[PDB]
Design an enzyme around this catalytic site. Structure first.
Site, mmCIF file in Angstrom:
data_model
loop_
_atom_site.group_PDB
_atom_site.id
_atom_site.type_symbol
_atom_site.label_atom_id
_atom_site.label_comp_id
_atom_site.label_asym_id
_atom_site.label_seq_id
_atom_site.Cartn_x
_atom_site.Cartn_y
_atom_site.Cartn_z
ATOM 1 N N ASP A 34 43.518 46.011 37.465
ATOM 2 C CA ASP A 34 42.618 45.486 38.708
ATOM 3 C C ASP A 34 41.551 45.012 38.490
ATOM 4 O OD1 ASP A 34 41.715 44.959 41.233
ATOM 5 O OD2 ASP A 34 41.391 46.992 41.747
ATOM 6 N N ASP A 220 40.977 38.138 41.317
ATOM 7 C CA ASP A 220 41.453 39.384 41.250
ATOM 8 C C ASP A 220 42.869 39.880 41.054
ATOM 9 O OD1 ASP A 220 41.793 42.189 41.981
ATOM 10 O OD2 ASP A 220 41.811 41.831 44.278
#
Length: 370
Positions: A34, A220
């Protein structure tokens, strides 16, 4: 770095994970990659959804920080106990480092029922780490403790099973075609970047670019969609709706409130426009653009897909919709992010994702929000 190629796996919509080991002896876990957060947190109790979990009692190298951490989300959340232990990445650099680890002891809407991962590796900066920027992110500990270059790259290939590569400490030129183009990392917290121009099928929205990055624009890997500020999203969809005027679709569709289906391989890809995002270049008044297809924002869920573009209050978020079309280099050392056409991106024989430049763009600074 052949050893690291194809070291990422996952299931559609459930994110990409890499195998990691924690503690001594090493306990193997699958961990979500992440770039949108900065905490290394792993399940540490027998939650029903987990295939396995971190058992601190079995680790001789475990060290308690005697501090807790509560991370709330719009609906769910995770809470854990902080500590440190030895961490390694089997299909990554041949090293082991002592990093902070939040042992998740309670959560809600965090773990996914049916998924194959048990933790999350936040690759962003300390500024957004929880409880505060004093909790050193994993990658920082890795670079500070080893000779691994301060850089990593991601090639997300999205196929229900998905795959990809996270090249730690380097770049694997076989994963992309053409040249890498770099955009500056505005500030070191999220991987913030500045979009200076947006084009749909070649026609731009001619909107005060400052809006495009209100109050942020980030890269992201933990988000599936392309999140856009309300104002930008409104105009965005408006243009896409006009380009795809050929066919009519419900308003819910565009809001991700309902899915759209098409018979066996009958998806009208060509009916949808390409999305081009021009990113701030490395030089004054210089930019470059990355272009994606419906293949990216119109992903499978007959053939039903969900519009992968949505609104935000936190700014723009370039998730898997964008990343799966490119090889992305997180050049932390030079505070820049590189994009190149990915050698694994899905494309039809008529249109292909691309990264082109240079282009002349003035007042790119007025695009950044303060």
């Amino acid at each position: 770095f052949v050893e690291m190629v194809d070291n990422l796996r996952g299931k559609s919509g459930q994110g990409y994970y890499v195998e990691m080991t924690v503690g001594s002896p090493p306990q193997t876990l699958n961990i979500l990659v992440d770039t949108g957060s900065s905490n290394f947190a792993v399940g540490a109790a027998p939650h029903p959804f987990l295939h396995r979990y971190y058992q601190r009692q079995l680790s001789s190298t475990y060290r308690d920080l005697r501090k807790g951490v509560y991370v709330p989300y719009t609906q769910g959340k995770w809470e854990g106990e902080l500590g440190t232990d030895l961490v390694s990445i089997p299909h990554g650099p041949n090293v082991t480092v002592r990093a902070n680890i939040a042992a998740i002891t309670e959560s809600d809407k965090f773990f996914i029922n049916g998924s194959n991962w048990e933790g999350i590796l936040g690759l962003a900066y300390a500024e957004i780490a929880r409880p505060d920027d004093s909790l050193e992110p994993f990658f920082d500990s890795l670079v500070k403790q080893t000779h691994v270059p301060n850089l990593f790259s991601l090639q997300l290939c999205g196929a229900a099973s998905v795959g990809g590569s996270m090249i730690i400490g380097g770049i694997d030129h076989s994963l992309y075609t053409g040249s890498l183009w770099y955009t500056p990392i505005r500030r070191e917290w999220y991987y913030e970047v500045i979009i200076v121009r947006v084009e749909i099928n070649g026609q731009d929205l001619k909107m005060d670019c400052k809006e495009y990055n209100y109050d942020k624009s980030i890269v992201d890997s933990g988000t599936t969609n392309l999140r856009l500020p309300k104002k930008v999203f409104e105009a965005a969809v408006k243009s896409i709706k006009a380009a795809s005027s050929t066919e009519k679709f419900p308003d819910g569709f565009w809001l991700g409130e309902q899915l759209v289906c098409w018979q066996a391989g009958t998806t009208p890809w060509n009916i949808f426009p390409v999305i081009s995002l021009y990113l701030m270049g490395e030089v004054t008044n210089q930019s470059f653009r990355i272009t994606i297809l419906p293949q990216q924002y119109l992903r499978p869920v007959d053939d039903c897909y969900k519009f992968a573009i949505s609104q935000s209050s936190t700014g723009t978020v370039m998730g898997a919709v964008i990343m799966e079309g490119f090889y992305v280099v997180f050049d932390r050392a030079r505070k820049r992010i590189g994009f190149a056409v990915s050698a694994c991106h899905v494309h039809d024989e008529f249109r292909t994702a691309a990264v082109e430049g240079p282009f002349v763009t003035l007042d790119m600074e007025d695009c950044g929000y303060n």
